Amino acid sequence: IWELKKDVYVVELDWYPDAPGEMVVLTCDTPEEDGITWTLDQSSEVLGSGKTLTIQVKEFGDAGQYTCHKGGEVLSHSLLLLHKKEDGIWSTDILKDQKEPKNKTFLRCEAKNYSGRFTCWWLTTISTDLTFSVKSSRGGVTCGAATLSAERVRGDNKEYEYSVECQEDSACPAAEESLPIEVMVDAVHKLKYENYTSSFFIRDIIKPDPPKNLQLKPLKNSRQVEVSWEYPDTWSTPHSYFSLTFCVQVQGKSKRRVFTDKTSATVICRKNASISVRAQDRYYSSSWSEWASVPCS
Numbered sequence: 001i002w003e004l005k006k007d008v009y010v011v012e013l014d015w016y017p018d019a020p021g022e023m024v025v026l027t028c029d030t031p032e033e034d035g036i037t038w039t040l041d042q043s044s045e046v047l048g049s050g051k052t053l054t055i056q057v058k059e060f061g062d063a064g065q066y067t068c069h070k071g072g073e074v075l076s077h078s079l080l081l082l083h084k085k086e087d088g089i090w091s092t093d094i095l096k097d098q099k100e101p102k103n104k105t106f107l108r109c110e111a112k113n114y115s116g117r118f119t120c121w122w123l124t125t126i127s128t129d130l131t132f133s134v135k136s137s138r139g140g141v142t143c144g145a146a147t148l149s150a151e152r153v154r155g156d157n158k159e160y161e162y163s164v165e166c167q168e169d170s171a172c173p174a175a176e177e178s179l180p181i182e183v184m185v186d187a188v189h190k191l192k193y194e195n196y197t198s199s200f201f202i203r204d205i206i207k208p209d210p211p212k213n214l215q216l217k218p219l220k221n222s223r224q225v226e227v228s229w230e231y232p233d234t235w236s237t238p239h240s241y242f243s244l245t246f247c248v249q250v251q252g253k254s255k256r257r258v259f260t261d262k263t264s265a266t267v268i269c270r271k272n273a274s275i276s277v278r279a280q281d282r283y284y285s286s287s288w289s290e291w292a293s294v295p296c297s
């Protein structure tokens, strides 16, 4: 048993029927010795008396808000959450595996520039009685609260998307990163305690916003057209240091590529086709932005 936060404790259990469990001794945080009584959750049943209470924690029934009373008053609480360890590996019932980069990815982090600011997201089937706590650091990072940012429909069930925004306290955009950023997330659903983590350098999780103000300018006595665009607003300043490279593609009806560092390109439009442009950090091979498109008709 260990303290997660003030008056909240986690008990690590090997998860299988009739597991021995853990002998847990709760001590009431009161200096009074007389008339102490003990209760679990909403039940009125006295489990014992005295300053100490011993329980065998073997299942969720033994977990909960243990309360010590004196003269009808509440003296202290000891909230017991469990951390199930099924077949040698900690449970992951709360968050869905996003499966995107390479399996067992529950936390997905992304940055839009080098400001030291980033966003992490996760998905759950659970709609309430669910709390999250996010902490982050390099190897001084401040994170806001995990907020509900999207609600979707996946088959029979519902999918809730949570996101958190963090900022490195004393960022330095242009500097080389020697130590990666670490995100730690605690997940509590009723009485189930879970643990999640992610390690990355800002440079690797970068994905700029798409090129903006895409324009198509036809040319006289030419089959070709000129497409032009601008750097996105959220991208890092100045562009001279933090430059972007681009890729142009003509997306037609068929489903069976030009690279440039410029904000313009000359291409051939065709009926029913669209011109598409993506961006990548010129100097680091991170994620390509989402497409910005302009149609040919």
Ligand SMILES: *[C@@H]1O[C@H](CO)[C@@H](O[C@@H]2O[C@H](CO)[C@@H](O[C@@H]3O[C@H](CO)[C@@H](O)[C@H](O)[C@@H]3O)[C@H](O)[C@H]2NC(C)=O)[C@H](O)[C@H]1NC(C)=O
Pocket (backbone or CB within 6 Å): 001, 002, 003, 010, 012, 083, 184, 186, 194, 195
């Ligand atoms: C994510 O979950 C894991 C596993 O439940 C957490 O690891 C556990 O962390 C606690 C807190 O530091 C460790 O407890 C300490 O154990 C020593 C004796 O071994 C004791 O002297 C300390 O007072 C305290 O009780 C616990 O051993 C450790 N479990 C394992 C198997 O390593 C981990 O901390 C969680 N991540 C978080 C909340 O950041």
Ligand SMILES: *Sc1ccc([N+](=O)[O-])c(C(=O)O)c1
Pocket (backbone or CB within 6 Å): 170, 171, 172, 173, 174, 175
């Ligand atoms: S890029 C950068 C900004 C601020 C500071 N700072 O003096 O705290 C540094 C730095 O000197 O570490 C770098």
Ligand SMILES: *Sc1ccc([N+](=O)[O-])c(C(=O)O)c1
Pocket (backbone or CB within 6 Å): 247, 248, 249, 257, 258, 278, 288
């Ligand atoms: S023009 C272009 C650049 C990058 C990528 N990409 O996302 O790997 C594509 C593409 O394959 O869609 C096209």
